[PDB]
Structures are given as C-alpha cells and as structure tokens.
Amino acid sequence: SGFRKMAFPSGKVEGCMVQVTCGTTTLNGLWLDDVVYCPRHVICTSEDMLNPNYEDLLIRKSNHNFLVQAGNVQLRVIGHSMQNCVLKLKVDTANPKTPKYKFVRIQPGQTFSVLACYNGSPSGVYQCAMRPNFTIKGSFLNGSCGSVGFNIDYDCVSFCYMHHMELPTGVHAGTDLEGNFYGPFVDRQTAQAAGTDTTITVNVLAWLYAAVINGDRWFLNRFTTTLNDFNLVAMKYNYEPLTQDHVDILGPLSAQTGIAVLDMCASLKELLQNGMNGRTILGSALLEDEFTPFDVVRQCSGVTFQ
Amino acid sequence: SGFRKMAFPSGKVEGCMVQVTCGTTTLNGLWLDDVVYCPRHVICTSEDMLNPNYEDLLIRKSNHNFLVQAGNVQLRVIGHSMQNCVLKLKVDTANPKTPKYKFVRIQPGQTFSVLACYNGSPSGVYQCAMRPNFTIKGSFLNGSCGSVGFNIDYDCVSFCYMHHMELPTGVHAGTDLEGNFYGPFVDRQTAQAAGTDTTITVNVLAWLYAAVINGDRWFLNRFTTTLNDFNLVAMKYNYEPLTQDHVDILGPLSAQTGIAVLDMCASLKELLQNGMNGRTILGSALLEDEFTPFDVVRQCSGVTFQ
C-alpha cells in the first residue's frame, strides 16, 4: 500500500552522463554508443546566448574545441554535427554502459524521470510531467542543461527529454533527443512565452483511482455525469478536455475498482466546483496530475524493469 | 531554479538488489561483498508470520534452503546467520558492483531514498523521511520487503533502512542494516502501534528557506518571536520542538537568505495558527517536512556524487 511519485531507477542513465566543455562553457552530455548528445548552446558564451547564430558559431569551432569528460577519462571528439538544437559530438570510444535505448517524442501529459546532473555527474532523480504547454517544472541549477528525461520499458530506456533552458519565468524548456524543442521555444536568452498551462485531466482521474485503490474513498459521490457535461466544467477550471481515448485508457482502472470512468468524472467535477475543503487525497491538498494511468497501474501492480 | 523532492541516483544500489527465496517465500536482498542481507521473515510462511519463533524456524532451515538469484544467475549460500531481524546469507561470490558503503542508523526526521524492488528487480525510487514515530510512509506492495533506503555521501552509499513490514495501518516499518528495528516494532503479523506522528519542524523551516531562495516570499511576516514562544505554539500543532542545535543547523540558510532563524520561526508560527489559506508554497498547499536543511543546501547548491 501507499503512493509516492516514484522515479524510474536511474542506473542505466547514470552511466551515460558525461561532461561537455566547449569554450569555458560546460554542461552535461548523453553518451550513447559513439555519440555524445548535448545542447548546442554549449558553444555559446553568456553574450552569445542573447542572439546566437548557431551555424556561424559552430563553424568557428572544431572537434578539438570540445572536451567531453566522463569521470577521470576524456573522450576524443572526432566529429561534430548539429541536429536541430542538439549537438551530436561523435567521440572515439563507444560507451560500454550503453543500454538498449530508444528516442521518443512524448506527448503533453506524459510523465518521465529526470536525472539532474552537474559537470556530468548525477545529483538526483525526480519524476515530472510534460505540461500541456510543453514546459516542465523541474529543479535545474546553472550547468544542469543537458540533463535528460527518460522512461524505462522493462529493458529499454526511452530518452524523451534533454534540458536546455530555464525561461525567465523559472519554468524549464528542452528538446527531444533529435533536438526538436518541446513547445514553441528556441535556445536563445530572450523572453519566450509558454502557453496557458492546463491540468492534465486523465492523470487526475488516474490518481483518484490510485486514491481509491489505497483507501481514500471520501470523494466518491452520489452523482453521475456525461463526457460532454464534464468537459464543460473542466474547461472552466483549466482542465484539459476528456476524450473517449482517455476513457478507454482508464478502462483497466475502472475494472479493478468497479467504478466507471464517467462516475469518477462526476466525483472529479464535484471536487472542482466545491473544493477539497480542508481534506486531503493520498496525502495531498491539491489535485495531482503528474501520474498517468500507466503510472498508477505500474505502481499499483509492481512492474519491474530489467 | 525550482524545487523537487529529488531522490539520490539509484545506480549504485541497483547493482546490489537480489532476490531471496526460502520456502516459496521470495523477497529482496542486499548483496554487499559476500553477504546478502534480507528480512529474516523470508523464512516465514503466511501462517508463521502470526507468531514466529525465529530461532526455531531458522534451525529448521539450511544454507541449501536459500535461493538467492541476481538476474539470470544464482548465488550459492554457504552460510547463514541471524543478526537481530536481518538474515545475513553468506554467499559464494562477492558482488562485483559492491560500492563503497556504510551502515548508518539514522535519526527521526532524516531523509533517504528508497529503491522499491520486487523479485530483486528495481521498480522505482523515491525520497522520504523517517517520521518522528520511526515509521515511513512509502509505497510497498507484496514482495517489496528487503527494499533498502540509502543516502549518498559523494562516493559512499550509506544504507540506513531495510523494509520489513506494512503495519495494518498501511504505514511501513523496518530496520537499520544491523537489523535493529526503527521504533518499537517487531517482525510479526500482529497489531502494532506507532506513536503519534509529529511534523519535523527543522525540515519545515529548511523548506521555507528553499521557498525564499526560489522566489516564494509571501509568508515572510512583520513579526518575530523567541525559541520558547515558538516551541509553545509548535507543540500545539504536533510539531517537534526546536532546539539550539536546530538553529545552528539552519545557520547557512539564514546567511544565504539574510533571514534569521528566529524570524523564519515567526513566519512559521503565523502559518501554523492562521493557515496558508488558499495559497501555496513551492507548489504545495501543505507545509512540507521531508526536506532536511542539508537537502535544501544540496539541491540549492548542486552537490554532485561520484
């Protein structure tokens, strides 16, 4: 019993974190096989960040200008290539600790673990969601750029996020591992707007189901509702709309608990309009949206990873 | 910027988790050098748990009755020994991935990371505190006993907790790695009372300091107070009393923020008596006590671990 945010075990990623140093700029890189992936703004100085011409900046750099260090060993850069916002630094040694990996572009509302690193060394791991506005509310200090987000599908590490920027609003922005930013952000020190963030409704519902599995039942109400009625209330509170695909995803949770998705939706609706109201759910005084339905099933069923 | 619970990177512990199987009972074990540590109640069946004579039960077992598996390899038990509530299973192979480690008995209010395991395989990692009543509010399903709690002092893993029991109240109980339970609990399927839990005041104060470092300043008040006055209010709300040692621990936070510990205490006192009150701190609607002053400094300063 019990419920915790729970990050994926980080070991397979820890052996892939490296330090990249360009011209006195140093951040983290991801060493997979013979390639180190890192934010292309490694090549930037504080002044360049204000208005960088990355192509012009990169042309003034050569393989020898990149100092990739892994513990007490240094990799030799034999090649460098810019894919969107990622620098692909081809090094001479394939990472012996390279796990079975995949690059995935996740969707807003999915969760993943972040391995926060500094100077290529791991400091901590935490679980977070991609907000609907494609930002993440992480914990990133100077030099943590290039820290990566990941999921683990048993034996396979799915890298889904590389940290690039802290926006002046203190939220974090980054790319997939192909260097395509999540959201409309660019790697420049300029004011950039993130959209209105919304709460991830399907995640809240999965968490309510977690609460039911773990004994918190006070919010189950005596009312019901339809999808169209619920979405009308959800839109008012900045909750993402619920689709039939969301209902179908919650099916297993509904079957385990005997509570139909639409009945849970009516419980949520009440919580939205009338509050929690001194009371807590799974220890929380706020509705939690950083658990997907798969996270709940995973944690409630004990899914292991090789 | 930003603040997250943050667990320690788990890699060094992942390579120490093994599966122990006695008589169709299987839980997790900790493989350090040539010894596997696991809850002695591995030797128990569901019926034995109600009233086990561990000495009598263990005498009916022999080394050959213990099946320690690590992935697709099995260790051979050459020796077994009972230290308090821990079984020390001496195996034939020293764990090649044995990190520099220490066993520590932590104090109530300290935090540590838990690597939740099933069948000796890691499922997730999360950070938690030892409650003042020596329980932990974790997430543990059947078969997660023997999962371990740990801290990382740069290069050194400090094992501080092994999970043994879920109490009928759904909270979790366990031992240090010498098998001495935390709290007055025993490894028997019987109703056992945990004390009144209190909030860890020094941790709340460190978290308020985190909130100040990260921009949340609305709770700084226009009042002050003394230690004796504050503890009088804290006792009323089930907050642990503050000592001068607690003040001294918070010194660095006071120096970074320019806010004296006793002034932060006055802010806390107000929050206690008058509430938060629709408002949040670091995203939270409840006062958080699972960050120690060292956790805050660690996360605000970017401490790396080898």
UniProtKB/Swiss-Prot annotation, chains A, B:
Changing residue 142 to A: Does not affect ability to cleave and inactivate human TRMT1. Changing residue 189 to A: Does not affect ability to cleave and inactivate human TRMT1. The active site is at 41 (for 3cl-pro activity), 145 (for 3cl-pro activity). It is found in: Host cytoplasm; Host Golgi apparatus; Host nucleus. Residues 1-306 are cytoplasmic. There is a cross-link at residues 5, 90 (Glycyl lysine isopeptide (Lys-Gly) (interchain with G-Cter in ubiquitin)). Inhibited by pyridone-containing alpha-ketoamides compounds 13a and 13b. In turn, alpha-ketoamide 13b (tert-butyl (1-((S)-1-(((S)-4-(benzylamino)-3,4-dioxo-1-((S)-2-oxopyrrolidin-3-yl)butan-2-yl)amino)-3-cyclopropyl-1-oxopropan-2-yl)-2-oxo-1,2-dihydropyridin-3-yl)carbamate) inhibits SARS-CoV-2 replication in human lung cells. Inhibited ex vivo by michael acceptor inhibitor N3. Inhibited ex vivo by compound 11a and 11b. Residues 1-306 form the Peptidase C30 domain. Cleaves the C-terminus of replicase polyprotein at 11 sites. Recognizes substrates containing the core sequence [ILMVF]-Q-|-[SGACN]. Cleaves and inactivates human TRMT1, preventing tRNA guanine(26)-dimethylation of tRNAs. May cleave human NLRP1 in lung epithelial cells, thereby activating the NLRP1 inflammasome pathway. May cleave human GSDMD, triggering alternative GSDME-mediated epithelial cell death upon activation of the NLRP1 inflammasome, which may enhance the release interleukins 1B, 6, 16 and 18. Also able to bind an ADP-ribose-1''-phosphate (ADRP). 3CL-PRO exists as monomer and homodimer. Only the homodimer shows catalytic activity. Interacts with host FBXO22; this interaction promotes the proteasomal degradation of nsp5. This is 3C-like proteinase nsp5. It comes from Severe acute respiratory syndrome coronavirus 2.
